[PDB]
Amino acid sequence: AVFYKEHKLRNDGLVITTNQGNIRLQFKSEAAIEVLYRADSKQLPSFALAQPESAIKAQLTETENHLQFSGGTLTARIQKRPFAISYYRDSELLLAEESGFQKINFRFYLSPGEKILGGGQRILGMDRRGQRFPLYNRAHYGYSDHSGQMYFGLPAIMSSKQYILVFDNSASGAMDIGKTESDILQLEAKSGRSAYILVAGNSYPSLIENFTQVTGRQPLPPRWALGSFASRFGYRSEAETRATVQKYKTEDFPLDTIVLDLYWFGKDIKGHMGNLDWDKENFPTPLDMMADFKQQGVKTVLITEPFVLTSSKRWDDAVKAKALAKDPQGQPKAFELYFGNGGIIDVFSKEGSRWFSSIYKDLSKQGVAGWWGDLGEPEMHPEDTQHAIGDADTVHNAYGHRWAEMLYQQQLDQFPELRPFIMMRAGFVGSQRYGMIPWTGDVSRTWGGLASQVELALQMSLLGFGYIHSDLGGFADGETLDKEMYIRWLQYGVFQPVYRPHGQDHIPSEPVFQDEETKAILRPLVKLRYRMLPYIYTAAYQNTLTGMPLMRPLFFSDEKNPALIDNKTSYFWGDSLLVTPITQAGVESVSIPAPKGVWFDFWKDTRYQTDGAPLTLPTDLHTIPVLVKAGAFMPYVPAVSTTEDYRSDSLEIHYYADASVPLAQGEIFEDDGKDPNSIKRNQFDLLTLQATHTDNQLHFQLARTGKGYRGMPERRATTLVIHNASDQYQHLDINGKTIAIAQADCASTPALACYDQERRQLQLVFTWGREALNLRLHK
Ligand SMILES: *[C@@H]1[C@@H](N)[C@H](CO)[C@@H](O)[C@H](O)[C@H]1O
Numbered sequence: 036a037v038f039y040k041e042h043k044l045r046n047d048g049l050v051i052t053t054n055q056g057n058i059r060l061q062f063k064s065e066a067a068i069e070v071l072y073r074a075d076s077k078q079l080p081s082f083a084l085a086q087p088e089s090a091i092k093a094q095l096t097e098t099e100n101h102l103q104f105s106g107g108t109l110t111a112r113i114q115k116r117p118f119a120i121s122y123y124r125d126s127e128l129l130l131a132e133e134s135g136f137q138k139i140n141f142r143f144y145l146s147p148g149e150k151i152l153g154g155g156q157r158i159l160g161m162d163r164r165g166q167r168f169p170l171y172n173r174a175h176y177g178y179s180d181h182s183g184q185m186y187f188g189l190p191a192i193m194s195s196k197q198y199i200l201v202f203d204n205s206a207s208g209a210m211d212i213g214k215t216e217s218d219i220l221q222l223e224a225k226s227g228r229s230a231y232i233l234v235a236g237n238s239y240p241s242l243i244e245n246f247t248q249v250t251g252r253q254p255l256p257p258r259w260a261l262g263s264f265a266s267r268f269g270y271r272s273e274a275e276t277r278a279t280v281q282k283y284k285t286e287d288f289p290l291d292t293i294v295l296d297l298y299w300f301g302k303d304i305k306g307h308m309g310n311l312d313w314d315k316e317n318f319p320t321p322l323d324m325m326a327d328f329k330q331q332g333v334k335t336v337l338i339t340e341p342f343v344l345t346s347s348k349r350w351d352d353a354v355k356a357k358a359l360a361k362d363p364q365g366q367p368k369a370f371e372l373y374f375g376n377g378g379i380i381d382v383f384s385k386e387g388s389r390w391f392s393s394i395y396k397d398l399s400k401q402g403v404a405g406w407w408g409d410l411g412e413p414e415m416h417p418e419d420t421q422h423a424i425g426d427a428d429t430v431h432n433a434y435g436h437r438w439a440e441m442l443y444q445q446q447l448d449q450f451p452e453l454r455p456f457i458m459m460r461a462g463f464v465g466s467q468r469y470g471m472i473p474w475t476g477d478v479s480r481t482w483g484g485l486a487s488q489v490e491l492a493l494q495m496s497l498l499g500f501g502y503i504h505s506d507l508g509g510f511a512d513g514e515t516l517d518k519e520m521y522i523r524w525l526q527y528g529v530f531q532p533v534y535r536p537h538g539q540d541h542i543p544s545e546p547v548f549q550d551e552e553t554k555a556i557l558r559p560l561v562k563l564r565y566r567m568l569p570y571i572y573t574a575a576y577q578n579t580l581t582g583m584p585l586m587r588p589l590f591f592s593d594e595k596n597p598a599l600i601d602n603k604t605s606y607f608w609g610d611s612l613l614v615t616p617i618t619q620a621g622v623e624s625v626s627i628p629a630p631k632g633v634w635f636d637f638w639k640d641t642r643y644q645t646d647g648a649p650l651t652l653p654t655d656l657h658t659i660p661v662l663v664k665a666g667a668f669m670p671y672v673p674a675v676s677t678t679e680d681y682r683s684d685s686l687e688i689h690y691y692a693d694a695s696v697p698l699a700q701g702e703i704f705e706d707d708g709k710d711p712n713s714i715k716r717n718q719f720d721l722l723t724l725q726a727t728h729t730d731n732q733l734h735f736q737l738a739r740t741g742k743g744y745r746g747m748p749e750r751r752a753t754t755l756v757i758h759n760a761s762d763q764y765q766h767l768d769i770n771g772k773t774i775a776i777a778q779a780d781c782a783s784t785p786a787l788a789c790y791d792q793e794r795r796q797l798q799l800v801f802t803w804g805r806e807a808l809n810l811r812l813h814k
Contacts, residue, residue, distance in 0.1 A: 036222030042102060047090040049104050050074065052081040053118050059092040065107025066245040067234040072136040079228045079425060082433045083464040085251040101637045109235045124235040125341060128304050129198045133219055139229050141222040143215045144749050150600045151318035153499060154210055155194030156475060158182040158487045161603050170208035172412040172432050172461045177511040179483030186412060186460045188477040191498050195597045197239065199246045201232040201464050205433035211624040226429045239591055240583060247582030251468025252543060253501055255579045257454040258708030259334055261571050262291030263561055264535040269296025272317040279545065280333055286547040288558055289565050292334040294407060299337055306375045309350065310344030311394045325402030332677030333508060334404035341413050344377035345369055360420045370421045379413055382437045383430060384423035392445045399449055405456030405791045411435030412461045430768050436463035454711045464499065472502040472533060480509035480517060485524050486618035490603040492531060496584035507536035508544050516542050518553060518619050525557050527616040529564045530608040532585050562674040568681065569670040569703045571746050574609040576704035579714060592630040596653035611667035615660045624653045627661050633665035633693040635758060642759055666691040668724050683686045687754045699726040707744045717742045737808040750804040760790065760797035768811040771799060
């Protein structure tokens, strides 16, 4: 039995005393509240909150039976007897405690019909209601089509009632989403912080904006993160690494970054981890190697791990420095990993952080451009291991998160004018604020492994991680390449956040090591990825601004149709492309559940209209099915080998016209690709395009804002291609100057305006300078 006794307001926070102790409620924004039970006791701080100390001004009202604590949009309604808190946005009940706070236990009611996304990486179905699973980051080597527990869990859910609930607790725990008791959501942990955070929104985009406002917004990654990565487990030598960079050049595939797995520090998988320094028998001139790659516009990224083995060169030093987690006796804790006997660097301590950070600094001075942190679950984490702030089981799910923070802060301190690249397997809610770019681990080389990636990506995207991606082509096991699967995976790759084929090196992961047919298929697609950089980089910009994920679920298309939540087969890549990956062999056609409206075949320009019924498209080996939304502006630049050469002096923009879309907007975000302060300081060039489409006219208004940046082109040569253009436009005005529209020979003359009757495309070619430009087509 729990009941209200009294309350106090203190520095904008409500402190309630029950018969069981104190509860502290603080609004972290108008739409988000932190609820801390056992508020009187000492416990671990928040990990989920970007500004854990903030408490914005709320209003408090009291009645006989209730308190009401209310920000702008979110209200907490506190029933006195029995004690229970429930949460309202407007007057809509979002979530109600059942027995609430009970070794740490939170129980809430679930509503009938309520669908619950969440839990981070699981392969269970998009709606996790009916499931129970651990909150314990753990490897799932070789997974395919099912997992209740893998590398990067999140103690958070997103409901069809448009709230996000975070269990702000780092410890070994569990989530029971109406499994044991059909109407009960239960959150449990062995130890750690007894708090939860509730965030509300009026739409899924606004909920996500509100969530990232309080948990952290991802800083814009360097533009090179959107390029082509060469990766395998693993390049065995400098000569092999150099030969791979060379193979990209001689096979004419784009390449931005090469990634070195654990052989850079020793010739065997076992026994060297912790060396954190070059194996000179196999990498004899690594500074020359990295400099030579930089001359070709290619970055070098190295793997690191949490573990220092007793057989490694840095064991004695790590012990001397007190850098490793300890046992209860105060000795360094050593335990038997696959790699040999070793300890774990205590990133929660001053000593471990300073020691590890010094190593990163040194290697980064040598030329390393970015960092890969593998095994941060931590993959092995014995229970008696003691960290500076608590035991292994208490801190487990925040280890990777703190490791990202340490490395992020380090990289900002060393290179304040560059954007850190930090790729890691395990984190916590909020890790995106340290730039964490996660991948879905050691996926099997099976169609099932591919078929799960959209579900995983959407689940992580929705709760903060825009750059979630997979090892393209698959990672684990296999004896010979499954060519069709590989092709499908690298096709899908183009339309998901990071283009990083990677796998165990008994089968080649890089597209340049494939047969002639595979390359003929993939080469134009990897170039397409580069041609599309203005589209992808603009979605990245919007992710930094608002948390809007790059991949969006089909359910965003109609928020009143909760049945769409189950879809894990078609997704939006940015605003305009509906993508349906092919995830089994031999598929001859697909049924695409396109939202009602007008849609075009990206590859063939075919126009489809639908009032609700799915569209059936045939498949081919060369592409995967992609539809463009009517009203899309699709921006392209010419293909480059590396983003170091990126220019937008030449722009090509495809507008998909249909009378059903009388107003359309597009934007292109351009900056120097590298300045971490470009957004904050307005050192960018934001191009805007507006189309107004009426019965007799099609009008485009073009403009630029921002203060620009060094090297920004003043005038861009622009080709605007209008798809599904009326054959009845007779003239064009460009800023009031009338230009005749040619009706022949458009591909074969330097025409300023020409209509291609066979393709229904109207091409305009002009100069887009700094002043506003209006293009008016008239019947
Ligand atoms: C971690 C390890 N299992 C591999 C060896 O370092 C990597 O190649 C893999 O991508 C990671 O998940």
